[PDB]
Write a protein that binds this ligand. Structure first.
Ligand SMILES: O=C(O)c1cc(C(=O)O)n(Cc2ccc(Cl)cc2Cl)n1
Length: 223
C-alpha cells in the first residue's frame, strides 16, 4: 500500500511527461491528476513530502523513484524508453504516453517544420501549466461546491488562453476531472498540493506560468 515519493532528481523527467500529454491531440488525461501531483512532490522533494504526510497523520510506505531504460517492441522493432519506477503508474502507461506524444509531434513537424521551444513537450513550464488546473480545482473544493466543473473550464479558457494556443492537449475539462478524481480518491494529495503552493508562491518572479500559478493559488484564500 505504497505512496511514490519522487525526489528533485526526477523533476525534469516528470515535467517532460506533463509536456508529452500537453502536445498530444485529444490526449487521454486519466493519469494527469496523478502526474501533476508527482511533479508537485518532485518540486517539494522526497524529504519534505514524507514530512508533510507523516505530520498530517498519514502513515506512508515510501517508494523510491528512479529513471530506468525499458526496452520494448513497437511495430516489429525494439525501442528504448526512459521510464520512472512508480507503483502508481505502470511502465506500459508511461510508454504509451510517449508513443501518442511522438505521433502528435510528427504531425506538428509536417504542419509547421521544426517546433519552437515553447511548443515542445520539454518546455520548462509544462508541469506548472498542469498545476494551474489543480489550483482552479482546489478553489472549487474550498468554496464548498461539487458541480464546479462548468466554472473550472470557463475560468481556465480565459486565464490559460496563451498556454492553450501553445498546447493542443491542454483540455481544461479532462484535466479538471482528473484532479477532482485524484483529490477525492487520494485526499493526502490535497495536503501535498497546499504545501507545494505555499512554498512556490514565495519564489518571486521567474516565468509567466509560475506567476499565473501564484496568482491562482493566492485566490484560494480570498482575492
Ligand atoms: O529533435 C528532437 O528534439 C525531437 C525528436 C523527436 C521525435 O523524433 O519524436 N522529438 C519528440 C520527442 C522526443 C522524445 C520524447 Cl521522450 C518524446 C517526444 Cl514527443 N523531439
Amino acid at each position: 500500500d505504497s505512496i511514490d515519493t519522487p525526489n528533485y532528481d526526477v523533476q525534469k523527467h516528470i515535467n517532460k511527461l506533463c509536456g508529452m500529454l500537453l502536445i498530444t491531440e485529444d490526449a487521454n488525461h486519466k493519469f494527469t491528476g496523478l502526474i501533476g501531483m508527482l511533479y508537485a512532490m518532485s518540486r517539494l522533494g522526497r524529504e519534505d513530502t514524507i514530512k508533510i504526510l507523516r505530520d498530517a497523520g498519514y502513515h506512508v510506505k515510501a517508494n523510491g523513484v528512479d529513471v530506468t531504460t525499458h526496452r520494448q517492441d513497437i511495430n516489429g522493432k525494439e525501442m528504448k524508453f526512459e521510464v520512472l519506477t512508480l507503483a502508481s503508474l505502470t511502465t506500459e502507461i508511461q510508454i504509451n504516453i510517449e508513443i501518442e506524444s511522438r505521433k502528435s509531434y510528427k504531425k506538428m513537424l509536417k504542419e509547421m517544420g521544426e517546433v519552437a521551444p515553447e511548443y515542445r513537450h520539454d518546455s520548462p513550464d509544462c508541469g506548472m501549466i498542469i498545476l494551474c488546473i489543480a489550483a482552479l480545482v482546489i478553489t472549487k473544493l474550498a468554496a464548498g461546491d461539487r458541480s464546479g466543473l462548468t466554472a473550472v473550464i470557463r475560468r481556465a479558457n480565459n486565464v490559460l488562453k496563451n498556454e492553450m494556443k501553445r498546447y493542443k492537449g491542454l483540455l481544461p475539462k479532462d484535466i479538471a476531472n482528473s484532479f477532482y478524481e485524484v483529490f477525492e480518491k487520494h485526499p493526502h494529495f490535497i495536503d501535498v498540493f497546499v504545501h507545494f503552493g505555499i512554498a512556490q508562491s514565495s519564489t518571486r518572479g521567474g516565468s509567466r506560468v509560475e506567476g499565473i500559478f501564484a496568482g491562482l493559488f493566492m485566490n484560494a484564500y480570498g482575492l
